[PDB]
Amino acid sequence: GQLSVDNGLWRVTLCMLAFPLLLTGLISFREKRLQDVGTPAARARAFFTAPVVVFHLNILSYFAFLCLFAYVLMVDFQPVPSWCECAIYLWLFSLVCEEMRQLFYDPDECGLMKKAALYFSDFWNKLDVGAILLFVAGLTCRLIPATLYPGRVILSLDFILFCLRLMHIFTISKTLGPKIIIVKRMMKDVFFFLFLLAVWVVSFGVAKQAILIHNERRVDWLFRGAVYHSYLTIFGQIPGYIDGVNFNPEHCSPNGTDPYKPKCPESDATQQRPAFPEWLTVLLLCLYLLFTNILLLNLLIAMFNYTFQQVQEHTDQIWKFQRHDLIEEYHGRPAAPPPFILLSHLQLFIKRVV
Amino acid sequence: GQLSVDNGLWRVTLCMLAFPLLLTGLISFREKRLQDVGTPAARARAFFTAPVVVFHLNILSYFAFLCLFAYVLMVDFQPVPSWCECAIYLWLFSLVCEEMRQLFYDPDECGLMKKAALYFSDFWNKLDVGAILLFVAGLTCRLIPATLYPGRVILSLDFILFCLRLMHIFTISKTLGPKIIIVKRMMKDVFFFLFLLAVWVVSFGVAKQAILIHNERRVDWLFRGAVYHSYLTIFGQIPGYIDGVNFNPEHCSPNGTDPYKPKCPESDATQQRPAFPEWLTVLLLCLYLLFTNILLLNLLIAMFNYTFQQVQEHTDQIWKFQRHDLIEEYHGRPAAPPPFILLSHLQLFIKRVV
Amino acid sequence: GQLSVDNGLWRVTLCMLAFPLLLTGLISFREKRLQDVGTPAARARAFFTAPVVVFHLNILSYFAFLCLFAYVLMVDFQPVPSWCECAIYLWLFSLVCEEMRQLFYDPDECGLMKKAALYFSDFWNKLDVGAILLFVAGLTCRLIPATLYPGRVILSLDFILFCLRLMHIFTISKTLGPKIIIVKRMMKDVFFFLFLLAVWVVSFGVAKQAILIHNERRVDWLFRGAVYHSYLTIFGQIPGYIDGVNFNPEHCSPNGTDPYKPKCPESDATQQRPAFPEWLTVLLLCLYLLFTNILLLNLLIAMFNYTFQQVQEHTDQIWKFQRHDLIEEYHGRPAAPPPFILLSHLQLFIKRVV
Amino acid sequence: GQLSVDNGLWRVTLCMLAFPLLLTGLISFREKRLQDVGTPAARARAFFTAPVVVFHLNILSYFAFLCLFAYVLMVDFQPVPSWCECAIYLWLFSLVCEEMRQLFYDPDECGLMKKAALYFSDFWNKLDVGAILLFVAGLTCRLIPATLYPGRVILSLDFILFCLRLMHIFTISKTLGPKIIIVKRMMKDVFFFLFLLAVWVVSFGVAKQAILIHNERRVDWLFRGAVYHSYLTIFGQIPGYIDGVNFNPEHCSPNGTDPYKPKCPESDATQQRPAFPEWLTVLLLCLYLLFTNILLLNLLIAMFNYTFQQVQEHTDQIWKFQRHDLIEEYHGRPAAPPPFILLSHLQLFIKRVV
């Protein structure tokens, strides 16, 4: 923008805070006709036109939107539309308004369905509209008094979709963007792996829950314990019986018959008797460990060691190429954050009417 | 197959669901003499001949077989042959029937023991027959009323052997197959490592269980606690005494004699007195940590970093080469999933008789 | 220094312990005019001039400073200035005295602000002065009786800043220094990743704490449980309800209607009824696992696999280049550890006065 | 040896079990003058001369020694020399007897101190004599009735030194040996890292234990809890207060003053009041996470990614070179396992006498 490009970044965040800090001699400009000749009003105004600053105002506004909404859903969730619930309603509206606005700006006569296909082809835009569709469903779900609790679950999912959106910060980074490109490549196969590990672990869970107990009258309470325990032992922790794996251990390795001195029990508790001795416990628990913490781990890191080396170099220039359109966007974007962008959306509608 | 090869894959799964979705204009064909001139009966029929579809019907049938059997073993396990127990009996039979069928199809006069050696040489076929042998043993084990509980343990193991078989899905993948090839290389040495880590951790477990308690009358209850705790601390979590490691701590680092101001105890609780003070606890617990979460981890990732770079390139063309025979198989495979494949097995036997 | 360079290192640490061990024939010298002709007084004196030894005396003194201060803060923390509190006060003073001393030694007429900029440009010096500023604030915070407890928190933070400083040991290592250089490169982006994972997990925490309970009257007790549970499940362990995830499970996968034999419940506990059945529990708990233990892990190891290969080679010579100034420093540094360096600081002030 | 080299390995282990399995046609030979012309006595005898078999007999005997000793120390530990205690005494004696025996076999007139230096230079021999010195100390420690409990701790350490010795198995492996070479390179720096992570985590432990409680009267009970909790949270699990981190949470993020609707508390519980509110808990717990599960992990994997690529290639031929002397050893080694090697040690002493 207007200001000098060698001032670092922390000085932007600090001068953003204290208005007169711009008036002081703690920020740099170029073209000393304005740096030395101090008109604070124009200097602050020009400061506000730098896309770097407008970018940071957006990121701060987004931060506020996210954590405020979180608070409202956290404690202030109430059947009657609270003031804050309407606040985020209009706040989100103003945000999607700007998003949709950038679809019709085309100064040339671009095809309408063409630019739609491009938006619909972008992974990031795809996730954004996913949240929009999910929210607008959750809104009426909350509005219906018979589905308030579902209303909570959908709005909670919406929150998550918004908070994972912050990976966008580093797309303009000096040193992180390229790595975002890489994980964009990985997204495809880490999804598919996710599947197989899911069915993997639940097959182990139900195996445990089947053998170490008789039939349970309800699966309802089973999964309350079993899936919670699954959550915990996703990383090999608790088999599934916190109260102890074997309700009745028995028998021990071939020993105790030592003519010199017994060491431990030794009897067929196993085939001749109900398979519920410590021996079965050893077999089952070691089986889980035989595969869980090893097979899937070496597999993944092999996948990544492979794929990484396939994209390591050209990923650089691709990021550099991508840099353009983002810069063009915020260069031309109106200088107002979403809370105060409404008056600029009114100006746009004024142009839309005339 | 007959249909166009550029329709993606989600459209196959969606058109699979809704019969008239084929009749609608939401799926592509080639040779517009059939795409434009709509005979729905032939269009759906031709759709059903595509090996891509027959593949998906198999994968859905297999999914159902696995989860239904799981349910039956989960809760409906009962001494008297339940209806569902017989259902999976015949369902599995129909599945191994098709498998054995593909051993005798050879249109040329191939040696009988030759094609047997090839089947027996295939790791995947090896695992399949492992499950077959284990199941058929478990069947009679359940049938004997004196070994019902063992019957549960064997059938549970059978289930696991079937569920790990699903890695076969991605052998036809665009981007995962090659990595399956790699782990097929790794299978050899990750097994051998598995051994040494097993004896490693149990040596630590028995060490703990030996020193921090007097002789236990039964190893039976020991392993009920010790091996469960081992399961948990497979990843360095609980030493083995959830009730606290030291039943009686004592003594502290050389301190407390500070002429200025004491800081902590300081006495030989150690050599002169029974080695059961906090000092021994510090020594033992840190010893576990000295090696467990470090030695074996850096070892493995070194192994993989090494071996990966030995197979990284030619693995590609090997997968491409392997692609053929699978495609040939499902091209020629009769178009019926296992539940409904029985009538086609009857047609084959009709040819076998005449 | 004076002594032979091929004696290894353990012999330095052992001869350091036992004064007459120098007098014995268990250490090497060069220039056998002193090795064979034994003047123990000069031999031990010359031994004390070797920067290798002076280095080790510093590292032992630093070790003592750190663990003694820890003890004093551990148990002997008391409102009235204890003897030991004053001991570390003067001990730290003597240490920063030597540090500041090395800023004015310049034998040439170097610019004063220049050498200040160089000190201020050094990451390691930056962390050192961070601790100095934090300590001197904590000192008066403790001194104020109304903020004793804050006094504890600041002094505890100070301790941590000192103990992480010990990575400096290996900067002179044969084989570790170069790797310190690498992580100095990594410091930048592992910080930024730290941010996104922080906001990531807390978004999941508040999501859990929002849906599986009604509004809590106080966030105070929430975070006492929720952030402790967050600490635990930073690595996917406990969702947030150790007392069980679902306070009331209900409904089960589409089953139980099996005309042959029921397997589990099956009812809309979900949309038609308050979204608090086991089905919601399965959805939420698996969602956490869908992303937490996978997305961020493969991301990081991709980042490191990338950046490592960008610095792997020239890092070597850079370390070799850096080696000089450290050697020059301890060569010229006065031969006294901080406890006994005071008399040498007096000699320096004597030169400063005259 | 005598038998054919293409028989695999499982057939060795199976024919080892069943004596007549050698007499059957399920094992291969070369020089069919003996394969076809069956003299079972000579065939089994020749089988017993193959170093491959003698190797396996040693590995089985060693396995038995280790697990039997474990049992004896596990439960049968008793002040009076038990029969089994004397059994392992003589068993170990017979083992070190063979080891020392291989020091004097030199058919040439090799220097006595030379071959001693070579033995003392070998890492593996170094660990072996470490166990010997530790055992022989533990023996008399047990023998003294006043130090029985220390006797337990030393013998338990001895056990560990023996069980980690089994990594020797894979030194003759086809595919693992080379990787053992690599970790032999790593041993140096993983030790040094071990140090810094140790002092790292305990600095965090004492920090926690200092701030979240007043002075404890005894460090004795502190470490019983704190070091056990440290053991658990070595991988970021439990801070140190399983009973809850904050004994009294208070204050909440700047909120609750929302003119629309309160969300949470908001007061200076922090500086103006004793620093023991939830805010301090958030600060401390996140601080632990800021560094523990990230800094040290990316550091290590960087170290290994670096060093691995420095040794990846020549490690191969080094293993191949090393292969010789092991083969020569067991070729010439007398054909008897330690239990039955005694009679062959007698024959050697017979030669030693005459």
Curated annotation (Swiss-Prot), chains A, B, C, D:
Gene Ontology cellular component terms for the protein in this record: cell projection; cytoplasmic vesicle membrane; ficolin-1-rich granule membrane; lysosomal membrane; lysosome; perikaryon; plasma membrane; specific granule membrane
Effect seen on changing I238 to L/F: No change in the reversal potential. No change in the ion selectivity to Ca(2+) over Na(+)
Impact when changing R224A: Abolishes channel activity
Regions of this protein lying in the Extracellular compartment: 73-83, 145-152, 207-226, 242-278
Reported effect, K263A: Nearly abolishes channel activity
Effect of Y241A: No change in the reversal potential. No change in the ion selectivity to Ca(2+) over Na(+)
Impact noted for substituting K261A: Decreases channel activity
Intramembrane region list: 9-25, 227-241, 336-354
Listed result of changing I238 to A/E/S: Alters the reversal potential. Increases the permeability of Ca(2+) over Na(+)
Expression sites (tissue/organ): Highly expressed in brain and peripheral blood cells, such as neutrophils. Also detected in bone marrow, spleen, heart, liver and lung. Isoform 2 is found in neutrophil granulocytes.
Main localization, broad class: membrane
Result for mutant: G236 to A/C/S: Decreases permeability of Ca(2+) over Na(+)
Subcellular location: Cell membrane; Perikaryon; Cell projection; Cytoplasmic vesicle
GO molecular function, one term: manganese ion transmembrane transporter activity
GO BP annotation list: calcium ion import across plasma membrane; calcium ion transmembrane import into cytosol; calcium ion transmembrane transport; calcium ion transport; cellular response to calcium ion; cellular response to hydrogen peroxide; cellular response to temperature stimulus; dendritic cell chemotaxis
UniProt-annotated binding residues for Ca(2+): E99, Q102, N125, E329
Disulfide bonds: C252-C264
Protein family (similarity comment): Belongs to the transient receptor (TC 1.A.4) family. LTrpC subfamily. TRPM2 sub-subfamily.
Domain remark from Swiss-Prot or TrEMBL: Contains two binding sites for ADP-ribose, one in the N-terminal part of the channel and the other in the C-terminal nudix hydrolase domain. Both sites seem to have a role in channel opening, but the interaction of ADP-ribose with the N-terminal site is absolutely required for channel activation.
Protein name per the record: Transient receptor potential cation channel subfamily M member 2
Origin organism lineage: Eukaryota, Metazoa, Chordata, Craniata, Vertebrata
Gene that this polypeptide is encoded by: TRPM2
Residues of the full protein shown: 745 to 1098 of 1503
